[PDB]
Symmetry: C3
Subunit: 258 residues, 3 copies
């Protein structure tokens, strides 16, 4: 059965904010070691993958895995009742037709409970993550958001190029061209602002700006973002959670491929 209680409804609301808009259907699965969820957009260029370990919850009980699919829009519609500080408990039996969201305030006072209708989705979780990527980098997610928000205005394609000690984002369209160049650096005054880069091979990939814009939402879940790029597979943008992570895998444009 499903029985997962979040200390603050806010964490779940921000997680769902990440799937929001860019995907319509999400397939959740709770099990002994936590909850995972996957959602793929219609064009199949973006995969949103979540993992929340048992320790991220205030209470978690699972003696029998349950897989459940649902409409993302329906879920978010209901995901603004958490008061953020409310407690949230996800509940479902072993053969559910619905998922119960139970928000409660500390005192017995107010109890908002929802029963969301589920969709049947053929269980088919993807495992496309690579052992090694050509290059790996992390930087503050607010910085990544700004970089994406800058360039987005110029083109529907933003290129990421990596060479030794150099990361360069570029957009070029009608009104002109733009670029943001960042360099690796360790800030001891607070290392959450550092910019790390490990390059095994220079990379140069292009992504559809509309998708990078969907991805930047993860800033609200983590201070830093990890970006792993390869010429052999979809790029991985990752936002770590306390016991967990939200991952976005994005297929590079072939020449025209988001």
């Amino acid at each position: 059965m499903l029985e997962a209680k979040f200390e603050e409804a806010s964490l779940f609301k921000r997680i769902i904010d990440g799937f929001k808009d860019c995907v319509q259907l999400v397939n959740f699965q709770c099990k002994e070691d936590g909850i995972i969820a996957q959602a793929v957009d219609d064009s199949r260029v973006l995969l949103v993958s979540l993992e929340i370990g048992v320790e991220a919850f205030q209470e978690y009980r699972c003696d029998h895995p349950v897989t459940l699919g649902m409409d993302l829009t329906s879920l978010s519609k209901i995901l603004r009742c958490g008061n953020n500080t409310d407690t949230l408990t996800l509940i479902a039996d072993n053969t559910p037709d619905s998922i119960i969201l139970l928000f409660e305030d500390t005192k017995k006072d107010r109890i908002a409970e929802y029963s969301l209708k589920l969709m049947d989705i053929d269980a088919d979780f993807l495992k496309i993550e690579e052992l090694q990527y050509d290059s790996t980098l992390s930087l503050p997610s607010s910085e990544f958001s700004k970089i994406v928000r800058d360039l987005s205005q110029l083109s529907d394609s933003i290129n990421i190029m990596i060479t030794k000690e150099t990361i360069k984002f570029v957009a070029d369209g009608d009104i002109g061209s733009g670029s943001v160049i960042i360099k690796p650096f360790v800030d001891m005054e607070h290392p959450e602002t550092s910019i790390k880069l490990e390059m095994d091979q220079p990379v140069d990939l292009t992504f559809g700006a509309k998708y990078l814009l969907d991805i930047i939402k993860g800033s609200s879940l983590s201070d830093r973002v990890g970006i792993r790029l390869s010429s052999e597979a979809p790029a991985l943008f990752q936002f770590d959670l306390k016991s967990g992570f939200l991952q976005f895998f994005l297929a590079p444009k072939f020449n025209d491929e988001e």
Copy 2:
């Protein structure tokens, strides 16, 4: 004649915010004991009724009642000049073709004066309030707003059910169902957060969510909201003012009736 000076233009602006959107025409009447106003929406399921006693004003003079009708939209268009802290004086002769709104700052400095064209409306004030209602309850208005905002997403109908010591709001639609259950309680740590309930008879009525959404606006006028329900008449939602009140009477849905 009409001569009513509000200490802060803000009070009048919030009052009008309450009539806003849900009604188009408002009929005001000033008299010896204050000002009253009534507005009914086109479908006739909602009545907005105001009462402001003489003491709510900094200066009020009336030796001859005046009734005046006007377009709500025109009034609000003009109701954003109050600086909130500005002083507002409503002025009109005994047989007016217009209503004068006079906003002045403490110093002689800036004087914004408006002359709003009036509409002729057949004077016919309704007196539909009941002696006793099946059930009566009050709770913080921000809480009521959240309850309404939650459920609204699920359906165009929100049901209110009352049984001994239990108040339950419910919505059920396409994506699923939701409910908010609250219980009466006295909080001495500050009684403005208490939830009172006096039930003479269990009630169970359904209202159109679009209307409850219009009604919640009153939160800006009072910390608490009083809700009086009956199976014999429109429900009453009331927001008290210092010397006065803003009331919303809403007809329950018959099965399909807002």
Copy 3:
């Protein structure tokens, strides 16, 4: 060549915010004593004229004037990368096909650089400013914005009338009429709130509210606004900068002329 470095990208962003929306093409010209820019709307009732002296920059070098025209929309699209606190350097060769905007953070870290495509515009700067205007007045720009925002709701025309020691703004339309009357006054408690008026001749001009609304944007550049009116020419609304000014010349309505 063009080489102008702004201490804070914010100043340039607010300046461009002033041209924004009301004009499409802007013609800049840098020279030995600074930078000027002019833009005229399609109907030719509004001229936006800028002057930034050498001292407004942290670094300015010019051994050869350069004139460059560009699409305002393209420029603003790029003008939200300044972080406000970023440093901004405008760069261009003597015969440019583009204008380079270079935003850099204090540390070497992040460098956002843009290359904006230029438009060819026949150089024809206007010099319509008058020696003497019928009347001159200055007042806080936030106050002027409120005055314009009030009246705008009532009509597409706002009349400004000046008589000895009296300034009166008036709008009259469908829902009724409104007026804001202000009087000259010296506030020693802080003279940035004073309202000065020098009248050589009473004036009475009408302007299209849509244009005055475009003009009020200058509030973000200066605490006060200077308004110079004449029955012989376009009115001048001026917002002073440290070493410079942003001016809006608006042609009075003939009876129907913005």
